[PDB]
Design a protein around this ligand. Structure first.
Ligand SMILES: CCCS(=O)(=O)Nc1ccc(F)c(C(=O)c2c[nH]c3ncc(-c4ccc(OC)cc4)cc23)c1F
Ligand SMILES: CCCS(=O)(=O)Nc1ccc(F)c(C(=O)c2c[nH]c3ncc(-c4ccc(OC)cc4)cc23)c1F
Ligand SMILES: C[N+](C)(C)C
Ligand SMILES: C[N+](C)(C)C
Lengths: 246, 258
């Protein structure tokens, strides 16, 4: 707690970047990102829950997840992480329209899976995984974010729509959707009633022609309508590592 | 300009930033961060190349802290211009997208640095023609840098920033640059663009062009100092001959700031 607190005198909040689970670029012993949560003058109960989550993030460390640097309470709850100069995967794919070579697509998927596997090995469900939460850092690594505050549509699993209902398996389906994004350059269904009941699912015929057959199949496994039929991240990750070498 | 050429083997073109004046802007690497503007030209004819080289000729001799530092050019695979990177994006993005709220003193500072940049360009016989918030950049070090002033003679041979005589036609001049600067001041002091309520282009053109419609000065901040508002109005005069020059604009600002 205390040792991770970044008093508001120590940090310069800069340009507003956008919204997630509200994000600014900032300064604190170098560049950072600061997420301002929608809370000021927290009640003791909110403060407590917040301290609990910061308790989890404190102990998370992996090259493929956003590095946690500290939190603030005044004037607003906030979370500070390292800055990712390469914007988000969502921005790269659907806005600036960057076209990565298939090697790079496979690489991004792999790094994402490494971070997700790590989170899950740490008993952290993401619940919100999407191309918007996948940031590209200057060193060319990929960092998953927005996994904080655990205990507190295009990427949603059918069971998560037709209400837990969240689970590790629903995370896996989100990752399937990200794979779809990577291999079609598009978002799916480009509704709730139809995906929830399993008569509508992402159109896999759309995927790139040079997408390796094992990637396409893994995407399909991750996107299965009944969650028990989805592969865990340990197996997802091994399968990606095998095919990337093959 | 052999010495200013940057062959494609020396630059790593990165993420697309957007479409500025004359071309498309990417972030890149060349002995550090750079911006590269890719012009809409590949396989230039000898005449395009020559025109482009003359322009590089001007750019290589320009140097002022309130204008993008020219770093060099490429001819292949496509014509390109390379300049220093501005980590703070554009004035336009700050005021209108991320709705950053500057204190009045920074607003005045931004107006001032821009004036210093514009004054510099004009002292250099360079007409901007495209001055707007979209091409006024905020550097990491908190300086402002004007861009898109490259290629003057090629433009020679955005309606919201356009002086009347430019709309109702080459009617470009130093004075129309001045009118543009006035629109930036309007943006700075009102936090908004002019004619915001008017969802129709050809309306703005016809009326502004004829002198019956002009930016609404009643919308400017309470805390905006009288001389700044006055200067803003002098800059926006419909008759180009009644606009001050940048030497006068800059001195007026230097003076009201103190
Ligand atoms: C340990 C993680 C805690 S968390 O689960 O709560 N996630 C978290 C916390 C705080 C943040 F600020 C962010 C966050 O969004 C970014 C962080 N570092 C970035 N670096 C760069 C861009 C970014 C630039 C430009 C963009 O273009 C629109 C998009 C994204 C975003 C971030 C975040 F994900
Ligand atoms: C010597 C001047 C020659 S010129 O007349 O041709 N101008 C010129 C040349 C080449 C360029 F790349 C640019 C140019 O646009 C930027 C330059 N350095 C930037 N640094 C940062 C953002 C920028 C980030 C993020 C944004 O967020 C949307 C917006 C703008 C743009 C530039 C430019 F103005
Ligand atoms: C402990 N941590 C620095 C890895 C977040
Ligand atoms: C010489 N310089 C124009 C690049 C500054």
């Amino acid at each position: 707690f205390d040792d991770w607190e970044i008093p508001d005198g120590q940090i310069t909040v800069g340009q507003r970047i956008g919204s997630g689970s509200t994000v600014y670029k900032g300064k604190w012993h170098g560049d950072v990102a600061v997420k301002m949560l929608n809370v000021t003058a927290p009640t003791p109960q909110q403060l407590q829950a917040f301290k609990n989550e910061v308790g989890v993030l404190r102990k998370t460390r992996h090259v493929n997840i956003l590095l946690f640097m500290g939190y603030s309470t005044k004037p607003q709850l906030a979370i500070v992480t390292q800055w990712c100069e390469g914007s988000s995967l969502y921005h790269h794919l659907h806005a600036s329209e960057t076209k990565f070579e298939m090697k790079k697509l496979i690489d991004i998927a792999r790094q994402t899976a490494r971070g997700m596997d790590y989170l899950h090995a740490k008993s952290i469900i993401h619940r919100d995984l999407k191309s918007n939460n996948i940031f590209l850092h200057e060193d060319n690594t990929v960092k998953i974010g927005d996994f904080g505050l655990a205990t507190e549509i295009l990427w949603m699993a059918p069971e998560v729509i037709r209400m837990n209902p969240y689970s590790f398996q629903s995370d896996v389906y989100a990752f399937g959707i990200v794979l779809y994004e990577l291999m079609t350059g598009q978002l799916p269904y480009s509704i709730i009633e139809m995906v929830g009941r399993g008569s509508l699912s992402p159109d896999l015929s759309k995927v790139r022609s040079n997408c390796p057959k094992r990637m396409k199949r893994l995407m399909a496994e991750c996107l299965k309508k009944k969650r028990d039929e989805r592969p865990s991240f340990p197996r997802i990750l091994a399968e990606i590592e095998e095919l990337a070498r093959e």
